PDB file of all heavy atoms in Angstrom:
ATOM      1  N   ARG X   1       0.883  -1.162   0.000  1.00 25.33           N
ATOM      2  CA  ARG X   1       0.000   0.000   0.000  1.00 25.33           C
ATOM      3  C   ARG X   1       0.923   1.214   0.000  1.00 25.33           C
ATOM      4  O   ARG X   1       1.349   1.684   1.057  1.00 25.33           O
ATOM      5  CB  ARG X   1      -0.933  -0.021   1.206  1.00 25.33           C
ATOM      6  CG  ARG X   1      -1.712  -1.322   1.349  1.00 25.33           C
ATOM      7  CD  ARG X   1      -2.891  -1.379   0.390  1.00 25.33           C
ATOM      8  NE  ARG X   1      -3.978  -0.507   0.814  1.00 25.33           N
ATOM      9  CZ  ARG X   1      -5.097  -0.316   0.130  1.00 25.33           C
ATOM     10  NH1 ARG X   1      -5.308  -0.914  -1.031  1.00 25.33           N
ATOM     11  NH2 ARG X   1      -6.028   0.494   0.625  1.00 25.33           N
ATOM     12  N   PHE X   2       1.229   1.718  -1.191  1.00 24.81           N
ATOM     13  CA  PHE X   2       2.260   2.733  -1.365  1.00 24.81           C
ATOM     14  C   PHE X   2       1.615   4.110  -1.401  1.00 24.81           C
ATOM     15  O   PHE X   2       0.529   4.279  -1.955  1.00 24.81           O
ATOM     16  CB  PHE X   2       3.051   2.497  -2.647  1.00 24.81           C
ATOM     17  CG  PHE X   2       4.189   1.535  -2.476  1.00 24.81           C
ATOM     18  CD1 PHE X   2       4.002   0.352  -1.782  1.00 24.81           C
ATOM     19  CD2 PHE X   2       5.456   1.842  -2.917  1.00 24.81           C
ATOM     20  CE1 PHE X   2       5.028  -0.539  -1.621  1.00 24.81           C
ATOM     21  CE2 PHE X   2       6.496   0.952  -2.720  1.00 24.81           C
ATOM     22  CZ  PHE X   2       6.278  -0.234  -2.073  1.00 24.81           C
ATOM     23  N   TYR X   3       2.260   5.097  -0.796  1.00 25.98           N
ATOM     24  CA  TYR X   3       1.686   6.434  -0.723  1.00 25.98           C
ATOM     25  C   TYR X   3       2.533   7.417  -1.518  1.00 25.98           C
ATOM     26  O   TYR X   3       3.767   7.374  -1.466  1.00 25.98           O
ATOM     27  CB  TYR X   3       1.555   6.893   0.729  1.00 25.98           C
ATOM     28  CG  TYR X   3       0.331   6.356   1.447  1.00 25.98           C
ATOM     29  CD1 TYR X   3      -0.229   5.133   1.099  1.00 25.98           C
ATOM     30  CD2 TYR X   3      -0.251   7.060   2.483  1.00 25.98           C
ATOM     31  CE1 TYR X   3      -1.335   4.632   1.756  1.00 25.98           C
ATOM     32  CE2 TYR X   3      -1.359   6.567   3.147  1.00 25.98           C
ATOM     33  CZ  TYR X   3      -1.893   5.355   2.780  1.00 25.98           C
ATOM     34  OH  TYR X   3      -2.997   4.868   3.444  1.00 25.98           O
ATOM     35  N   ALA X   4       1.865   8.293  -2.272  1.00 31.57           N
ATOM     36  CA  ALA X   4       2.526   9.289  -3.102  1.00 31.57           C
ATOM     37  C   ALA X   4       2.000  10.680  -2.787  1.00 31.57           C
ATOM     38  O   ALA X   4       0.784  10.895  -2.747  1.00 31.57           O
ATOM     39  CB  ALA X   4       2.327   8.989  -4.592  1.00 31.57           C
ATOM     40  N   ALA X   5       2.923  11.618  -2.575  1.00 30.27           N
ATOM     41  CA  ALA X   5       2.603  13.001  -2.250  1.00 30.27           C
ATOM     42  C   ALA X   5       2.846  13.896  -3.457  1.00 30.27           C
ATOM     43  O   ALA X   5       3.938  13.880  -4.037  1.00 30.27           O
ATOM     44  CB  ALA X   5       3.447  13.499  -1.079  1.00 30.27           C
ATOM     45  N   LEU X   6       1.830  14.654  -3.833  1.00 31.91           N
ATOM     46  CA  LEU X   6       1.853  15.584  -4.949  1.00 31.91           C
ATOM     47  C   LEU X   6       1.394  16.943  -4.441  1.00 31.91           C
ATOM     48  O   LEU X   6       0.720  17.025  -3.409  1.00 31.91           O
ATOM     49  CB  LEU X   6       0.967  15.092  -6.108  1.00 31.91           C
ATOM     50  CG  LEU X   6       1.568  14.030  -7.043  1.00 31.91           C
ATOM     51  CD1 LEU X   6       1.670  12.647  -6.408  1.00 31.91           C
ATOM     52  CD2 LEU X   6       0.784  13.950  -8.339  1.00 31.91           C
ATOM     53  N   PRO X   7       1.765  18.033  -5.126  1.00 31.93           N
ATOM     54  CA  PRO X   7       1.412  19.376  -4.619  1.00 31.93           C
ATOM     55  C   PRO X   7      -0.082  19.611  -4.470  1.00 31.93           C
ATOM     56  O   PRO X   7      -0.489  20.449  -3.657  1.00 31.93           O
ATOM     57  CB  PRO X   7       2.032  20.323  -5.654  1.00 31.93           C
ATOM     58  CG  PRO X   7       2.258  19.492  -6.867  1.00 31.93           C
ATOM     59  CD  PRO X   7       2.592  18.127  -6.342  1.00 31.93           C
ATOM     60  N   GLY X   8      -0.911  18.905  -5.234  1.00 30.59           N
ATOM     61  CA  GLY X   8      -2.348  19.069  -5.151  1.00 30.59           C
ATOM     62  C   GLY X   8      -3.098  17.783  -4.880  1.00 30.59           C
ATOM     63  O   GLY X   8      -4.265  17.817  -4.479  1.00 30.59           O
ATOM     64  N   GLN X   9      -2.442  16.639  -5.069  1.00 30.79           N
ATOM     65  CA  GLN X   9      -3.084  15.342  -4.920  1.00 30.79           C
ATOM     66  C   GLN X   9      -2.315  14.471  -3.940  1.00 30.79           C
ATOM     67  O   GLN X   9      -1.122  14.661  -3.702  1.00 30.79           O
ATOM     68  CB  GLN X   9      -3.154  14.586  -6.251  1.00 30.79           C
ATOM     69  CG  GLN X   9      -3.786  15.309  -7.408  1.00 30.79           C
ATOM     70  CD  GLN X   9      -3.901  14.400  -8.607  1.00 30.79           C
ATOM     71  OE1 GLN X   9      -2.898  13.970  -9.162  1.00 30.79           O
ATOM     72  NE2 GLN X   9      -5.126  14.076  -8.998  1.00 30.79           N
ATOM     73  N   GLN X  10      -3.035  13.512  -3.360  1.00 29.42           N
ATOM     74  CA  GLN X  10      -2.446  12.467  -2.531  1.00 29.42           C
ATOM     75  C   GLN X  10      -2.929  11.126  -3.058  1.00 29.42           C
ATOM     76  O   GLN X  10      -4.139  10.905  -3.162  1.00 29.42           O
ATOM     77  CB  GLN X  10      -2.849  12.637  -1.068  1.00 29.42           C
ATOM     78  CG  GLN X  10      -2.546  14.002  -0.499  1.00 29.42           C
ATOM     79  CD  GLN X  10      -2.985  14.119   0.939  1.00 29.42           C
ATOM     80  OE1 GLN X  10      -3.055  13.125   1.655  1.00 29.42           O
ATOM     81  NE2 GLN X  10      -3.279  15.335   1.371  1.00 29.42           N
ATOM     82  N   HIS X  11      -1.998  10.235  -3.393  1.00 27.72           N
ATOM     83  CA  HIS X  11      -2.345   8.984  -4.053  1.00 27.72           C
ATOM     84  C   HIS X  11      -2.074   7.806  -3.128  1.00 27.72           C
ATOM     85  O   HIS X  11      -1.007   7.732  -2.507  1.00 27.72           O
ATOM     86  CB  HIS X  11      -1.570   8.804  -5.357  1.00 27.72           C
ATOM     87  CG  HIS X  11      -1.878   9.836  -6.397  1.00 27.72           C
ATOM     88  ND1 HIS X  11      -1.362   9.775  -7.672  1.00 27.72           N
ATOM     89  CD2 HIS X  11      -2.651  10.947  -6.354  1.00 27.72           C
ATOM     90  CE1 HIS X  11      -1.800  10.805  -8.371  1.00 27.72           C
ATOM     91  NE2 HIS X  11      -2.585  11.532  -7.594  1.00 27.72           N
ATOM     92  N   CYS X  12      -3.035   6.890  -3.055  1.00 31.44           N
ATOM     93  CA  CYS X  12      -2.870   5.608  -2.383  1.00 31.44           C
ATOM     94  C   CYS X  12      -2.844   4.529  -3.456  1.00 31.44           C
ATOM     95  O   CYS X  12      -3.794   4.396  -4.232  1.00 31.44           O
ATOM     96  CB  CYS X  12      -3.998   5.357  -1.380  1.00 31.44           C
ATOM     97  SG  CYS X  12      -4.007   3.698  -0.680  1.00 31.44           S
ATOM     98  N   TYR X  13      -1.759   3.763  -3.496  1.00 29.99           N
ATOM     99  CA  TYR X  13      -1.467   2.820  -4.560  1.00 29.99           C
ATOM    100  C   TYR X  13      -1.517   1.398  -4.033  1.00 29.99           C
ATOM    101  O   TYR X  13      -0.987   1.102  -2.958  1.00 29.99           O
ATOM    102  CB  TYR X  13      -0.092   3.084  -5.169  1.00 29.99           C
ATOM    103  CG  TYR X  13      -0.088   4.199  -6.175  1.00 29.99           C
ATOM    104  CD1 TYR X  13       0.557   5.397  -5.908  1.00 29.99           C
ATOM    105  CD2 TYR X  13      -0.719   4.050  -7.399  1.00 29.99           C
ATOM    106  CE1 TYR X  13       0.566   6.415  -6.829  1.00 29.99           C
ATOM    107  CE2 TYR X  13      -0.720   5.067  -8.325  1.00 29.99           C
ATOM    108  CZ  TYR X  13      -0.076   6.247  -8.034  1.00 29.99           C
ATOM    109  OH  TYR X  13      -0.075   7.260  -8.964  1.00 29.99           O
ATOM    110  N   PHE X  14      -2.127   0.514  -4.814  1.00 31.91           N
ATOM    111  CA  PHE X  14      -2.103  -0.919  -4.555  1.00 31.91           C
ATOM    112  C   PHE X  14      -1.514  -1.583  -5.785  1.00 31.91           C
ATOM    113  O   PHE X  14      -2.114  -1.547  -6.866  1.00 31.91           O
ATOM    114  CB  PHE X  14      -3.493  -1.470  -4.240  1.00 31.91           C
ATOM    115  CG  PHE X  14      -3.479  -2.897  -3.775  1.00 31.91           C
ATOM    116  CD1 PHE X  14      -2.680  -3.281  -2.713  1.00 31.91           C
ATOM    117  CD2 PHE X  14      -4.251  -3.859  -4.405  1.00 31.91           C
ATOM    118  CE1 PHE X  14      -2.654  -4.591  -2.283  1.00 31.91           C
ATOM    119  CE2 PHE X  14      -4.228  -5.172  -3.978  1.00 31.91           C
ATOM    120  CZ  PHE X  14      -3.426  -5.537  -2.916  1.00 31.91           C
ATOM    121  N   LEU X  15      -0.328  -2.172  -5.623  1.00 30.48           N
ATOM    122  CA  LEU X  15       0.357  -2.802  -6.745  1.00 30.48           C
ATOM    123  C   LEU X  15      -0.391  -4.028  -7.245  1.00 30.48           C
ATOM    124  O   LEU X  15      -0.280  -4.367  -8.429  1.00 30.48           O
ATOM    125  CB  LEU X  15       1.791  -3.161  -6.362  1.00 30.48           C
ATOM    126  CG  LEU X  15       2.551  -2.108  -5.557  1.00 30.48           C
ATOM    127  CD1 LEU X  15       3.905  -2.639  -5.121  1.00 30.48           C
ATOM    128  CD2 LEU X  15       2.705  -0.826  -6.364  1.00 30.48           C
ATOM    129  N   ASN X  16      -1.137  -4.699  -6.367  1.00 31.48           N
ATOM    130  CA  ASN X  16      -1.958  -5.856  -6.723  1.00 31.48           C
ATOM    131  C   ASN X  16      -1.136  -6.939  -7.409  1.00 31.48           C
ATOM    132  O   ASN X  16      -1.322  -7.267  -8.582  1.00 31.48           O
ATOM    133  CB  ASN X  16      -3.146  -5.437  -7.599  1.00 31.48           C
ATOM    134  CG  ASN X  16      -4.267  -6.466  -7.604  1.00 31.48           C
ATOM    135  OD1 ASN X  16      -4.058  -7.639  -7.296  1.00 31.48           O
ATOM    136  ND2 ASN X  16      -5.462  -6.025  -7.962  1.00 31.48           N
ATOM    137  N   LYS X  17      -0.194  -7.484  -6.651  1.00 28.51           N
ATOM    138  CA  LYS X  17       0.647  -8.541  -7.173  1.00 28.51           C
ATOM    139  C   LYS X  17      -0.184  -9.808  -7.389  1.00 28.51           C
ATOM    140  O   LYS X  17      -1.321  -9.929  -6.918  1.00 28.51           O
ATOM    141  CB  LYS X  17       1.836  -8.787  -6.240  1.00 28.51           C
ATOM    142  CG  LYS X  17       1.490  -9.159  -4.813  1.00 28.51           C
ATOM    143  CD  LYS X  17       1.517 -10.659  -4.613  1.00 28.51           C
ATOM    144  CE  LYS X  17       1.301 -11.044  -3.165  1.00 28.51           C
ATOM    145  NZ  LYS X  17       1.317 -12.523  -3.012  1.00 28.51           N
ATOM    146  N   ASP X  18       0.397 -10.738  -8.145  1.00 29.19           N
ATOM    147  CA  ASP X  18      -0.237 -12.005  -8.529  1.00 29.19           C
ATOM    148  C   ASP X  18      -1.543 -11.776  -9.285  1.00 29.19           C
ATOM    149  O   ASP X  18      -2.533 -12.482  -9.080  1.00 29.19           O
ATOM    150  CB  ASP X  18      -0.480 -12.893  -7.306  1.00 29.19           C
ATOM    151  CG  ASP X  18       0.801 -13.396  -6.687  1.00 29.19           C
ATOM    152  OD1 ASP X  18       1.818 -13.489  -7.406  1.00 29.19           O
ATOM    153  OD2 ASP X  18       0.791 -13.697  -5.474  1.00 29.19           O
ATOM    154  N   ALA X  19      -1.550 -10.780 -10.163  1.00 28.76           N
ATOM    155  CA  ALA X  19      -2.703 -10.536 -11.014  1.00 28.76           C
ATOM    156  C   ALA X  19      -2.850 -11.658 -12.040  1.00 28.76           C
ATOM    157  O   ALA X  19      -1.846 -12.195 -12.520  1.00 28.76           O
ATOM    158  CB  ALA X  19      -2.577  -9.185 -11.720  1.00 28.76           C
ATOM    159  N   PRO X  20      -4.077 -12.045 -12.386  1.00 26.97           N
ATOM    160  CA  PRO X  20      -4.286 -13.163 -13.320  1.00 26.97           C
ATOM    161  C   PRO X  20      -4.029 -12.761 -14.766  1.00 26.97           C
ATOM    162  O   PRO X  20      -4.818 -12.034 -15.376  1.00 26.97           O
ATOM    163  CB  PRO X  20      -5.754 -13.541 -13.082  1.00 26.97           C
ATOM    164  CG  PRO X  20      -6.392 -12.290 -12.600  1.00 26.97           C
ATOM    165  CD  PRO X  20      -5.346 -11.539 -11.829  1.00 26.97           C
ATOM    166  N   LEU X  21      -2.917 -13.235 -15.318  1.00 25.17           N
ATOM    167  CA  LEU X  21      -2.627 -13.038 -16.728  1.00 25.17           C
ATOM    168  C   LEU X  21      -3.302 -14.119 -17.572  1.00 25.17           C
ATOM    169  O   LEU X  21      -3.689 -15.169 -17.051  1.00 25.17           O
ATOM    170  CB  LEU X  21      -1.117 -13.053 -16.965  1.00 25.17           C
ATOM    171  CG  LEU X  21      -0.247 -12.029 -16.233  1.00 25.17           C
ATOM    172  CD1 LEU X  21       1.218 -12.250 -16.566  1.00 25.17           C
ATOM    173  CD2 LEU X  21      -0.668 -10.617 -16.604  1.00 25.17           C
ATOM    174  N   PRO X  22      -3.480 -13.872 -18.877  1.00 25.27           N
ATOM    175  CA  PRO X  22      -4.051 -14.914 -19.753  1.00 25.27           C
ATOM    176  C   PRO X  22      -3.257 -16.206 -19.762  1.00 25.27           C
ATOM    177  O   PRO X  22      -3.842 -17.282 -19.949  1.00 25.27           O
ATOM    178  CB  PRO X  22      -4.053 -14.246 -21.135  1.00 25.27           C
ATOM    179  CG  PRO X  22      -4.131 -12.802 -20.846  1.00 25.27           C
ATOM    180  CD  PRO X  22      -3.361 -12.580 -19.579  1.00 25.27           C
ATOM    181  N   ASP X  23      -1.942 -16.139 -19.560  1.00 26.40           N
ATOM    182  CA  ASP X  23      -1.103 -17.328 -19.521  1.00 26.40           C
ATOM    183  C   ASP X  23      -1.351 -18.181 -18.282  1.00 26.40           C
ATOM    184  O   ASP X  23      -0.867 -19.319 -18.230  1.00 26.40           O
ATOM    185  CB  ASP X  23       0.372 -16.927 -19.573  1.00 26.40           C
ATOM    186  CG  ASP X  23       0.761 -16.303 -20.900  1.00 26.40           C
ATOM    187  OD1 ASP X  23       0.147 -16.658 -21.929  1.00 26.40           O
ATOM    188  OD2 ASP X  23       1.675 -15.452 -20.911  1.00 26.40           O
ATOM    189  N   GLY X  24      -2.081 -17.671 -17.291  1.00 28.73           N
ATOM    190  CA  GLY X  24      -2.383 -18.401 -16.084  1.00 28.73           C
ATOM    191  C   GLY X  24      -1.482 -18.083 -14.911  1.00 28.73           C
ATOM    192  O   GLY X  24      -1.856 -18.367 -13.769  1.00 28.73           O
ATOM    193  N   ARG X  25      -0.320 -17.492 -15.158  1.00 32.10           N
ATOM    194  CA  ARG X  25       0.612 -17.107 -14.112  1.00 32.10           C
ATOM    195  C   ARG X  25       0.644 -15.589 -13.986  1.00 32.10           C
ATOM    196  O   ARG X  25      -0.147 -14.877 -14.609  1.00 32.10           O
ATOM    197  CB  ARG X  25       2.001 -17.678 -14.408  1.00 32.10           C
ATOM    198  CG  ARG X  25       2.224 -19.086 -13.889  1.00 32.10           C
ATOM    199  CD  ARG X  25       2.664 -19.071 -12.428  1.00 32.10           C
ATOM    200  NE  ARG X  25       1.553 -18.854 -11.509  1.00 32.10           N
ATOM    201  CZ  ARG X  25       0.595 -19.735 -11.253  1.00 32.10           C
ATOM    202  NH1 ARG X  25       0.586 -20.933 -11.813  1.00 32.10           N
ATOM    203  NH2 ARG X  25      -0.378 -19.404 -10.409  1.00 32.10           N
ATOM    204  N   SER X  26       1.540 -15.093 -13.139  1.00 32.54           N
ATOM    205  CA  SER X  26       1.754 -13.667 -12.977  1.00 32.54           C
ATOM    206  C   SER X  26       3.023 -13.267 -13.725  1.00 32.54           C
ATOM    207  O   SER X  26       3.678 -14.090 -14.369  1.00 32.54           O
ATOM    208  CB  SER X  26       1.834 -13.294 -11.498  1.00 32.54           C
ATOM    209  OG  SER X  26       3.099 -13.619 -10.954  1.00 32.54           O
ATOM    210  N   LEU X  27       3.375 -11.986 -13.637  1.00 29.23           N
ATOM    211  CA  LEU X  27       4.570 -11.476 -14.314  1.00 29.23           C
ATOM    212  C   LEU X  27       5.781 -11.790 -13.443  1.00 29.23           C
ATOM    213  O   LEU X  27       6.261 -10.968 -12.659  1.00 29.23           O
ATOM    214  CB  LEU X  27       4.444  -9.985 -14.588  1.00 29.23           C
ATOM    215  CG  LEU X  27       5.614  -9.362 -15.355  1.00 29.23           C
ATOM    216  CD1 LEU X  27       5.726  -9.985 -16.733  1.00 29.23           C
ATOM    217  CD2 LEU X  27       5.477  -7.854 -15.447  1.00 29.23           C
ATOM    218  N   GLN X  28       6.261 -13.023 -13.564  1.00 29.17           N
ATOM    219  CA  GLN X  28       7.396 -13.463 -12.772  1.00 29.17           C
ATOM    220  C   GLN X  28       8.668 -12.758 -13.233  1.00 29.17           C
ATOM    221  O   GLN X  28       8.855 -12.488 -14.420  1.00 29.17           O
ATOM    222  CB  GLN X  28       7.558 -14.977 -12.887  1.00 29.17           C
ATOM    223  CG  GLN X  28       6.262 -15.752 -12.701  1.00 29.17           C
ATOM    224  CD  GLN X  28       5.622 -15.521 -11.352  1.00 29.17           C
ATOM    225  OE1 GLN X  28       4.398 -15.447 -11.243  1.00 29.17           O
ATOM    226  NE2 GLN X  28       6.438 -15.441 -10.309  1.00 29.17           N
ATOM    227  N   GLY X  29       9.558 -12.475 -12.283  1.00 26.84           N
ATOM    228  CA  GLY X  29      10.787 -11.780 -12.614  1.00 26.84           C
ATOM    229  C   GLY X  29      11.917 -12.111 -11.663  1.00 26.84           C
ATOM    230  O   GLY X  29      11.705 -12.574 -10.539  1.00 26.84           O
ATOM    231  N   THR X  30      13.137 -11.859 -12.138  1.00 28.58           N
ATOM    232  CA  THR X  30      14.343 -12.062 -11.341  1.00 28.58           C
ATOM    233  C   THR X  30      15.244 -10.835 -11.419  1.00 28.58           C
ATOM    234  O   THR X  30      14.853  -9.810 -11.982  1.00 28.58           O
ATOM    235  CB  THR X  30      15.114 -13.310 -11.787  1.00 28.58           C
ATOM    236  OG1 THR X  30      15.408 -13.224 -13.187  1.00 28.58           O
ATOM    237  CG2 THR X  30      14.316 -14.575 -11.504  1.00 28.58           C
ATOM    238  N   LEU X  31      16.453 -10.934 -10.873  1.00 27.52           N
ATOM    239  CA  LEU X  31      17.410  -9.840 -10.897  1.00 27.52           C
ATOM    240  C   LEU X  31      18.615 -10.225 -11.744  1.00 27.52           C
ATOM    241  O   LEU X  31      19.098 -11.360 -11.677  1.00 27.52           O
ATOM    242  CB  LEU X  31      17.847  -9.474  -9.469  1.00 27.52           C
ATOM    243  CG  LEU X  31      18.777 -10.396  -8.662  1.00 27.52           C
ATOM    244  CD1 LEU X  31      19.370  -9.665  -7.469  1.00 27.52           C
ATOM    245  CD2 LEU X  31      18.082 -11.669  -8.192  1.00 27.52           C
ATOM    246  N   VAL X  32      19.078  -9.283 -12.566  1.00 30.26           N
ATOM    247  CA  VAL X  32      20.232  -9.494 -13.435  1.00 30.26           C
ATOM    248  C   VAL X  32      21.370  -8.568 -13.019  1.00 30.26           C
ATOM    249  O   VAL X  32      21.144  -7.401 -12.679  1.00 30.26           O
ATOM    250  CB  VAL X  32      19.859  -9.304 -14.924  1.00 30.26           C
ATOM    251  CG1 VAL X  32      19.413  -7.875 -15.214  1.00 30.26           C
ATOM    252  CG2 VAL X  32      21.014  -9.714 -15.828  1.00 30.26           C
ATOM    253  N   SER X  33      22.590  -9.107 -12.988  1.00 27.81           N
ATOM    254  CA  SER X  33      23.758  -8.302 -12.649  1.00 27.81           C
ATOM    255  C   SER X  33      24.878  -8.476 -13.672  1.00 27.81           C
ATOM    256  O   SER X  33      25.680  -7.561 -13.882  1.00 27.81           O
ATOM    257  CB  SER X  33      24.264  -8.658 -11.248  1.00 27.81           C
ATOM    258  OG  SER X  33      25.587  -8.189 -11.045  1.00 27.81           O
TER     259      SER X  33
END
């Protein structure tokens, strides 16, 4: 539940992980170095 401060607006964000993609899984990811 991420919060964002703007000069006129205040935003409450929900990233909503594990969203249902057509492929049946979510947008899985890793880290590259």
Side-chain angles (χ1 to χ4, degrees):
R1 307 282 286 177
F2 274 45
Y3 279 29
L6 279 73
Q9 306 185 295
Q10 306 179 27
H11 296 185
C12 172
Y13 279 111
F14 188 54
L15 318 174
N16 200 339
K17 58 96 175 179
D18 292 335
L21 301 178
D23 293 330
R25 273 275 78 71
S26 78
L27 183 63
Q28 313 300 142
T30 55
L31 72 164
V32 63
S33 163

